[PDB]
Design a protein around this ligand. Structure first.
Ligand SMILES: O=S(=O)(O)O[C@H]1[C@@H](O)[C@@H](CO)O[C@@H](OC[C@H]2O[C@H](O[C@@H]3[C@@H](O)[C@H](O)[C@@H](CO)O[C@@H]3O)[C@@H](O)[C@@H](O)[C@@H]2O)[C@@H]1O
Ligand SMILES: O=S(=O)(O)O[C@H]1[C@@H](O)[C@@H](CO)O[C@@H](OC[C@H]2O[C@H](O[C@@H]3[C@@H](O)[C@H](O)[C@@H](CO)O[C@@H]3O)[C@@H](O)[C@@H](O)[C@@H]2O)[C@@H]1O
Ligand SMILES: CC(C)CCC[C@H](C)CCC[C@H](C)CCC[C@H](C)CCO
Ligand SMILES: CC(C)CCC[C@H](C)CCC[C@H](C)CCC[C@H](C)CCO
Ligand SMILES: CC(C)CCC[C@H](C)CCC[C@H](C)CCC[C@H](C)CCO
Ligand SMILES: CC(C)CCC[C@H](C)CCC[C@H](C)CCC[C@H](C)CCO
Ligand SMILES: CC(C)CCC[C@H](C)CCC[C@H](C)CCC[C@H](C)CCO
Ligand SMILES: CC(C)CCC[C@H](C)CCC[C@H](C)CCC[C@H](C)CCO
Ligand SMILES: CC(C)CCC[C@H](C)CCC[C@H](C)CCC[C@H](C)CCO
Ligand SMILES: CC(C)CCC[C@H](C)CCC[C@H](C)CCC[C@H](C)CCO
Ligand SMILES: CC(C)CCC[C@H](C)CCC[C@H](C)CCC[C@H](C)CCO
Ligand SMILES: CC(C)CCC[C@H](C)CCC[C@H](C)CCC[C@H](C)CCO
Ligand SMILES: CC1=C(/C=C/C(C)=C/C=C/C(C)=C/C=O)C(C)(C)CCC1
Ligand SMILES: CC1=C(/C=C/C(C)=C/C=C/C(C)=C/C=O)C(C)(C)CCC1
Ligand SMILES: CC1=C(/C=C/C(C)=C/C=C/C(C)=C/C=O)C(C)(C)CCC1
Ligand SMILES: OC[C@H]1O[C@@H](O)[C@H](O)[C@@H](O)[C@@H]1O
Ligand SMILES: CCCCCCCC
Lengths: 231, 230, 232
């Protein structure tokens, strides 16, 4: 059942390679940088892939893998992803917050909501009672939908009042994040952690591609542009 | 290994009030332009929402665990500490922000609140019965330190802001010093310490203090003049 | 080879609980007055470090913070409670140092986060069942520390040598203390019960107790007596 600890190793190893090179890249590129504003963006955007490197290595080496009893058998679960996402997503949000110079009110309401989204997901991923896992999923999705709402119908208007570079950069990112983040509830749902439509194998591969691109990718769009009165 | 069955009604009622209290605070902060009042709404809404998630887990059994102390397995709801760990520092942040407290006292405060819950959690999961009280004492000492700065510290600075501020804070300060200090008493006499009171009534007690300490504290706050705006 | 524990190093943990608790009451019954908001931060940060450590030292004393990890072919005792402590403690020591040199929000985050990976990774290696892998995590955690010390040494110095002669002097002493005491942790752990068998858990608990007391209570003193915290 979702025979793990061996098939998806190549995906996990690959995810570790990209995330690590992606990190060494953003490290051996932030070298100069004087502007204190651009300093935040480089800091935030380098820890995201870095944290991920750590977590992908655990899954590859086994540690981040655990078994849960549900549906009818011993089910392989990678909790290490929620260890990653728990911190990683809020940093991704901080980048956009700092880029649109959002109010401290929305930043908190955003990070805290993000906390519930991952937290609730972790719960559902480890819940033993099958039916309930989807109660947590629904709650986690509602949390993401709220975050995506303020990013789309909230951070755009405030972005379209900054500089043409800012409004244009935020938008590309906003597009990449509303799309990449919304796929997560879908993969989770059809994967080893919900219905068994798709095997852990493909559930690892899909996450590894959405991850690299929601991180190394998102970071490339951001760090290569004019990061608000700094570059 | 029943553990979670009698107090289901309390937990479900607790999940109910925490859910509605949140939706209420969500479908109430709709407008709000002032960045200062924005903070208060953001802080005050996460508290009940966080508690919703945690009460649900207890009701669905997940937030329940068996601790082997005193020749037996014991029904311990760790989910309260998962809740409290984050929830309480937020209630204190509202207060800090209301009295425009220094970043020094905020950190000292939050830090201390972290020790309070963390220690309580440790005590609640300790196998050696005796020790559980050592941790309870250490936790109470931490609470006592917190309530001090809130009472004999945050008041003086509140009585120098505005008549709305000083009056609002005082009502909250009254509600928090009273509700917060009840917790160590319920824990001590409950299923987590001495068996004076069954897990049942305890779950009910916490559920009444939780709803008021959050949805109640929230209402008093979100109805008054919350800094630079409303 | 190694084997079960929970009693020889009771004294080291007791003494460690001891010093840490006193050091905290000392820093508490010393921050009594203090009106300056700038120095306020420093007292608030420097007080919690030992307070957190007291809690984590006591747990290791009362057995709670001890656990058994299977590896190398046999079960083994590990004190995870240190990592619980360090996770929150070390970054506060960095915050004190960042606030002193008035460091940029960019580097504070780049510092805290790196510290998170440093402890976190350490914890992971400490709990890894496959023996070979534990060193892979060690290597990584050390690389994280090394970075952290770099921005402190070859980074916070130059920004310090531009503040006030008090600041520049206070920071250098601390910098000297941290770079020296922090760099021992990877050495103790590598030779200790959580790595190779060179030295028993007994002495490894002792070593960390010496290093913890000084790196916190010692550091805390050098700092709260400098007034180069703009507070009097
Ligand atoms: O599942 S049942 O509701 O039917 O009753 C209990 C038993 O089935 C028991 C033995 O299988 O398992 C219990 O659920 C497992 C535990 O879940 C939570 O803790 C888990 C921990 O066990 C896992 O190791 C970890 C990931 O691998 O996730 C969590 O930390 C707690 O609720 C525990 O109390 C519980 O035993 C089940 O409740
Ligand atoms: O073999 S001994 O009897 O001599 O000692 C063992 C027993 O006392 C046994 C009793 O069940 O407990 C063993 O320690 C258990 C672990 O306790 C703590 O971890 C718990 C975790 O297991 C629980 O899931 C959770 C809530 O239920 O609380 C804690 O996190 C830690 O102290 C672990 O290190 C310890 O192994 C004891 O060794
Ligand atoms: C954010 C601060 C407050 C907490 C930091 C916590 C650390 C990142 C550790 C994260 C541990 C995760 C949530 C554990 C989930 C349950 C796993 C089965 C435990 C495996 O040890
Ligand atoms: C179940 C989940 C989706 C509930 C989500 C709750 C939200 C994260 C709470 C955030 C604060 C709410 C919106 C009330 C304050 C109103 C502010 C204008 C929000 C943005 O700062
Ligand atoms: C303000 C910031 C620091 C906190 C934001 C909100 C927090 C992340 C709270 C959300 C925590 C969720 C419910 C997860 C709790 C931990 C899980 C019960 C662990 C399961 O082992
Ligand atoms: C596994 C623990 C140590 C790490 C995760 C802790 C959470 C981030 C917040 C606090 C939750 C406490 C520590 C959980 C205690 C053990 C419970 C049986 C966990 C059930 O998920
Ligand atoms: C065991 C318990 C009581 C320890 C509590 C320790 C405190 C959280 C430490 C906070 C910092 C102390 C008060 C020193 C700074 C002095 C400030 C005037 C305190 C309020 O900001
Ligand atoms: C806001 C931040 C920087 C300061 C506050 C940090 C908190 C004081 C740290 C929490 C410490 C408590 C004692 C919890 C330690 C870990 C738990 C005892 C583990 C339970 O398995
Ligand atoms: C203080 C709040 C954030 C909860 C504590 C967060 C710490 C990361 C958790 C402390 C436990 C560390 C990580 C070790 C986990 C493994 C232990 C066997 C779990 C016993 O609780
Ligand atoms: C594996 C270890 C060495 C990776 C550590 C990476 C760091 C957390 C990243 C910090 C940001 C790097 C230095 C790139 C931005 C340059 C800035 C001057 C950093 C301080 O804001
Ligand atoms: C404040 C936030 C945003 C930044 C700091 C976050 C930390 C760097 C995140 C910690 C990541 C390390 C690898 C720990 C992951 C969780 C542990 C491996 C769980 C052990 O059971
Ligand atoms: C190999 C070198 C670079 C390691 C780092 C420096 C050394 C740890 C220096 C020792 C630092 C202070 C004196 C603490 C020593 C504590 C131990 C009892 C030392 C045992 O040799
Ligand atoms: C709503 C929802 C989820 C959303 C996850 C997201 C949005 C992950 C983002 C990952 C990133 C950004 C990685 C770097 C979870 C947690 C899968 C739980 C199931 C439902
Ligand atoms: C001192 C002490 C405690 C304090 C708990 C408090 C003050 C809880 C506040 C709850 C809120 C605010 C709910 C929302 C614990 C943790 C029960 C452990 C026993 C001793
Ligand atoms: C790099 C490395 C480590 C560094 C630890 C440090 C530097 C601890 C500092 C402790 C203090 C200051 C205590 C108070 C760990 C985590 C042992 C893991 C093994 C290698
Ligand atoms: O990740 C697989 C390989 O991809 C190549 O494009 C990189 O240059 C290598 O460094 C990497 O190992
Ligand atoms: C083969 C290593 C380079 C891959 C580039 C991927 C960019 C997201």
């Amino acid at each position: 059942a979702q025979i793990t600890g061996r098939p998806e190793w190549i995906w996990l190893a690959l995810g570790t390679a990209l995330m690590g090179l992606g990190t060494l890249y953003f490290l051996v590129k932030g070298m100069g940088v004087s502007d204190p504003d651009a300093k935040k963006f480089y800091a935030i955007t380098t820890l995201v892939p870095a944290i991920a490197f750590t977590m992908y290595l655990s899954m590859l080496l086994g540690y981040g893998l655990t078994m849960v009893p549900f549906g009818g058998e011993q089910n392989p679960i990678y909790w290490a992803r929620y260890a990653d996402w728990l911190f990683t997503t809020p940093l991704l949000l901080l980048d956009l917050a700092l880029l649109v110079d959002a109010d401290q009110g929305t930043i908190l309401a955003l990070v805290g909501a993000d906390g519930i989204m991952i937290g609730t997901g972790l719960v559902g991923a480890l819940t033993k009672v099958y039916s309930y896992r989807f109660v947590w999923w629904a709650i986690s999705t509602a949390a993401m939908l709220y975050i995506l709402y303020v990013l789309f119908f909230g951070f755009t208007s405030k972005a379209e009042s900054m500089r043409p570079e800012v409004a244009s950069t935020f938008k590309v990112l906003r597009n990449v994040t509303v799309v990449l983040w919304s796929a997560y509830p879908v993969v989770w749902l059809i994967g080893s952690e919900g219905a068994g439509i798709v095997p852990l194998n493909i559930e690892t591969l899909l996450f590894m591609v959405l991850d690299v691109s929601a991180k190394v990718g998102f970071g490339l769009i951001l760090l290569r542009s004019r990061a608000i009165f700094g570059e």
